């Protein structure tokens, strides 16, 4: 096809001048004369038969005038069941040293979002075994979830506990896309999925496909790897009808990489410093991760929050794309409460009495009401002390602290930190325990009897142990 010449190299932004046969936007171009395959994705047409492109790998060693070849199609990755148990990078090459991925078809990573007449409405609660999640913000089968959190508050531990519970109990070809995360964590996940039998290195019956572009990758790879994993999941949903799980961690890195290349594309910076096209990029990417009438994609996404802002344009823009947000807090994690989910900031769309039932709904609303009352009291509690509160106020503070402690839970993936064995509290135990703590059936137990327990039976047992030993 068409051949052109590099005319400018600035970071990950390469300008390529074609003499004839200009390539459409979003096409893939192969730089000629390199040891490893370097792919440039067309982003703009500058005129003068020049295009501007974003490089999917490093641009060092590139010389002005180097040959570039046009592929005639966007980045195409192999899609199919043969991707299960394999690791592939942003451009579909296997990075697990197990040979080529011999699939029958390749899909472009740029596609159109499903139409409005394909949207599905069904809303069925997805039980995760986590107390605060299943009580205050239940997830939904086939709904986008999203886990917001600052730096080091429990995003990856929570996403791995969700992986364990849901993905292991599942039967529908999970997919994991590591976007701008630690390569160490990717190796850990690969090997803990090899040992658990979810990835089968021989006699291939795997049920998870991994796609990884990590912190070490240039901005173009970190900006398109989410689309690559998204494409794998879209294949599993549409052309098989399967019920896919899709885990994305971390998806703020997509916006951040767009912001890193936006300056070099010559665009006036928006607010904060992000690209002017933040919301529409997030929309074109996030509207493809969706359940249709053809298949179901349960999408859990970790979302980094820069400097613990939550009003930074990237988290603020992500909020509108999710059905059940779970917001972790640093102030809570400094109290020792894990998972550090903020009870008064995590929402859900199925938190509706006509879906979860009046029992669940009323218990959740009461828990949130008592926690809100405690928060509003906290200021004069810490100024004057509790000795000045009303007796009803002392009761609301007591029950609120107890509910705080009961919301925490030891995680199976956190035995290395908690020392306790991981508990998986089913839904009715959660509802009943919290209903009882609300009613006042435990006004005599010490508050530390609820910290890091399973169901309320373990709380009463821990209280008995504390009372007898001490």
């Amino acid at each position: 096809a068409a051949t052109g010449r590099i005319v400018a190299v600035i970071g990950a932004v390469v300008d390529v001048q074609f003499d004839e046969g200009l390539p459409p936007i979003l096409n893939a171009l192969e730089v000629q004369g390199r040891e490893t395959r370097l792919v440039l994705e067309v982003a703009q047409h500058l005129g003068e038969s020049t295009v501007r492109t974003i490089a999917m790998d490093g641009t060092e060693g590139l010389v002005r005038g180097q040959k570039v070849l046009d592929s005639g199609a966007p980045i195409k990755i192999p899609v199919g069941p043969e991707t299960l148990g394999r690791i592939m990078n942003v451009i579909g090459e296997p990075i697990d040293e197990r040979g080529p991925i011999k699939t029958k078809q390749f899909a472009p990573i740029h596609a159109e979002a499903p139409e409005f007449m394909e949207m599905s409405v069904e809303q069925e609660i997805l039980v995760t075994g986590i107390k605060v999640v299943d009580l205050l913000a239940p997830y939904a089968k086939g709904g986008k979830i999203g886990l917001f959190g600052g730096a080091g508050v429990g995003k990856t531990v929570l996403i791995m506990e969700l992986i364990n519970n849901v993905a292991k109990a599942h039967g529908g070809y999970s997919v994991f896309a590591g976007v701008g995360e630690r390569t160490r964590e990717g190796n850990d996940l690969y090997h803990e999925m090899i040992e658990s039998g979810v990835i089968n290195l021989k006699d291939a019956t795997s049920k998870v496909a991994l796609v990884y572009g990590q912190m070490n990758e240039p901005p173009g790879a970190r900006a398109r790897v989410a689309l690559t994993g998204l494409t794998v999941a879209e294949y599993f949903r549409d052309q098989e009808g399967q019920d896919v799980l899709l885990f994305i961690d971390n998806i703020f890195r997509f916006t951040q990489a767009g912001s890193e290349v936006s300056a070099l594309l010559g665009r006036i910076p928006s607010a904060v410093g992000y690209q002017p096209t933040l919301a529409t990029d997030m929309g074109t990417m996030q509207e493809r991760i969706t359940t249709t009438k053809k298949g179901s994609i349960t999408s859990v996404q970790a979302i980094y929050v820069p400097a613990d802002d939550l009003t930074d344009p990237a988290p603020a823009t992500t909020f509108a794309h999710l059905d059940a947000t779970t917001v972790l807090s640093r102030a809570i994690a400094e109290l020792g409460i894990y998972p550090a989910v903020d009870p008064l900031d995590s929402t859900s769309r199925i938190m509706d009495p006509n879906i979860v039932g009046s029992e669940h709904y009323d218990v959740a609303r009461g828990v949130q009401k008592i926690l809100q009352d405690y928060k509003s009291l906290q200021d004069i509690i810490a100024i004057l002390g509790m000795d000045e509160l009303s007796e009803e106020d002392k009761l609301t503070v007591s029950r609120a602290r107890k509910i705080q402690r009961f919301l925490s839970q030891p995680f199976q993936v956190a035995e290395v930190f908690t020392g306790h064995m991981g508990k998986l509290v089913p839904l009715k135990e959660t509802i009943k325990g919290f209903q009882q703590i609300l009613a006042g059936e435990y006004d005599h137990l010490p508050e530390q009897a609820f910290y890091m327990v399973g169901p309320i039976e373990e709380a009463v047992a821990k209280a008995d142990k504390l009372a007898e030993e001490h």
């Binding site: 400018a8 490093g58 590139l62 390569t183 890193e260």
Partner: protein, 487 residues
């Protein structure tokens, strides 16, 4: 000496002349040189200016080349000739650097002559992928009781040392470097740790005194010091961490174990912000460029632990971050917390209250942690951590006070793992619950001297086995009880 000049300095003197490719400086300013020419120069290739300076070809543009000047742009004028070197920016690596102080480009600044390096390695290489790595298992001993017990560090890890100014971060790194002497002198060559100390934006006098502290402890013989101090150009303070990281990747790739300290990364982010703002790039939060996260993450991602098919080496990174007023929710602190595998929070309240090292045990964490402890240290430190959590909950109480005073340590005093285990054992079994607190340190001192002067056999058994067996358990029990009766 006279013939030390005609040595070969004249005969072998590179007095060649070759057909070189050149460019001409159009405009020097803001530490960036717009250069005309260099048609075949590569992106990120090192060029050499007329004054003997060096630069990196950052912006290949249609009509000019933007060159980042590694030095003072005072020595560059418009019209200067700029030669290609054909080599993407790289630094000398090898074992010939151990004992040498160098600047960010690999040039010796210790006056001991040239580094006899035979290998060069690029500063901007890519970190290893997913397959070359393997989980952290081997302990990286610091010699500090608090760190080695509660916040263990393995080989191949990234552990942030974060805290305000003058809270003992450099002291922790220097003790970690001094502690590796007991391993580097031993026989097992899979426990030797070669240390690297990159000093960025620091006072040059402080770096000289650091090299002195390392030479007095005879730790320079296995330590590289890369120095890009406060008066050096911002591009040099930008490059220094990657130079040090390549010097450490040399050991990581050849089946050896390196440790690297970046002191600190906040100053490298400040230098990169200077360069970015002088390049008219859009400033984000706190005027930092959009890719300061990438700046630190492509660097701290090269600290890996290879598997036994890729050599089995490692590279441990201890990046340092200085917070303002104890704010950890700032931009760059949270960036590096997002990159690393844990933190060591040093506090000003603890440091001012005589608790040194002022490690906040409740906030310090090590995501890898347990997988890289010895068995004996694990045995005693599990109970110690449980009791410390109990004590901070109620802030038993006397046990907690006893333990926290047992965690104090002196500067330039890294303890072997056996002696830390002995002290923590004497603290965690209760054997000074009734000794009033202020004598504890004294007791500790005396106690350990006892255990090292007379019971060397028990310590040797702990060293050989790695665990404190039931036999050694009762042995240490009678030792500590007999001493306490004597004390």
């Amino acid at each position: 000496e006279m013939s030390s000049i005609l040595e070969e300095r004249i005969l072998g003197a590179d007095t060649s002349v070759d057909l070189e490719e050149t460019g001409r400086v159009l405009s020097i300013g803001d530490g960036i040189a717009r250069v005309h020419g260099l048609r075949n120069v590569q992106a990120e290739e090192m060029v050499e200016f007329s004054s003997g300076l060096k630069g990196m070809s950052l912006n290949l543009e249609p009509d000019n080349v933007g060159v980042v000047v590694f030095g003072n742009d005072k020595l560059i004028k418009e019209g200067d000739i700029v030669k290609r070197t054909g080599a993407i920016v790289d630094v000398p690596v090898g074992e010939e650097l151990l004992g040498r102080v160098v600047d960010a480009l690999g040039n010796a600044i210790d006056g001991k002559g040239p580094i006899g390096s035979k290998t060069r390695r690029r500063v901007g290489l890519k970190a290893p992928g997913i397959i070359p790595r393997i989980s952290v298992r081997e302990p990286m001993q610091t010699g500090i009781k608090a760190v080695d017990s509660l916040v263990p560090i393995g080989r191949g890890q990234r552990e942030l040392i974060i805290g305000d100014r003058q809270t003992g971060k450099t002291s922790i790194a220097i003790d970690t470097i001094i502690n590796q002497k007991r391993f580097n002198d031993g026989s097992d060559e899979k426990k030797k740790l070669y240390c690297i100390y990159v000093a960025i934006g620091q006072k040059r006098s402080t770096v000289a005194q650091l090299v002195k502290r390392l030479t007095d402890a005879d730790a320079m013989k296995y330590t590289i010091v890369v120095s890009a101090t406060a008066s050096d150009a911002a591009p040099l303070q930008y490059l220094a961490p990657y130079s040090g990281c390549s010097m450490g990747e040399y050991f990581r790739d050849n089946g050896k174990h390196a440790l690297i300290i970046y002191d600190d990364l906040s100053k490298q982010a400040v230098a990169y912000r200077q360069m970015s703002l002088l390049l008219r790039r859009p400033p984000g939060r706190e005027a930092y460029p959009g890719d300061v996260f990438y700046l630190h993450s492509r660097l701290l991602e090269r600290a890996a632990k290879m598997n036994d098919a890729f050599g089995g080496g490692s590279l441990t990174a201890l990046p340092v971050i200085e917070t303002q007023a104890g704010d950890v929710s700032a931009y760059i602190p949270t960036n590096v917390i997002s990159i690393t595998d844990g933190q060591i929070f040093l506090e000003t309240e603890l440091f001012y209250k005589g608790i040194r090292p002022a490690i906040n045990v409740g906030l310090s964490v090590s995501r890898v942690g347990s997988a890289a402890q010895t068995r004996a240290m694990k045995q005693v430190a599990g109970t110690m951590k449980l009791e410390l959590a109990q004590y901070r909950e109620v802030a038993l109480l006397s046990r907690g006070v006893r333990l926290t005073e047992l965690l104090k340590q002196g500067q330039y005093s890294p303890m072997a793992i056996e002696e830390q285990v002995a002290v923590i054992y004497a603290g965690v079994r209760g054997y000074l619950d009734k000794l009033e607190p202020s004598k504890i340190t004294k007791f500790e001192n005396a106690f350990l001297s006892h255990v090292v002067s007379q019971h060397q056999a028990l310590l040797g058994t702990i060293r050989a086995d790695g665990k404190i067996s039931e036999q050694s358990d009762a042995k240490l029990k009678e030792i500590v009880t007999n001493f306490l009766a004597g004390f």
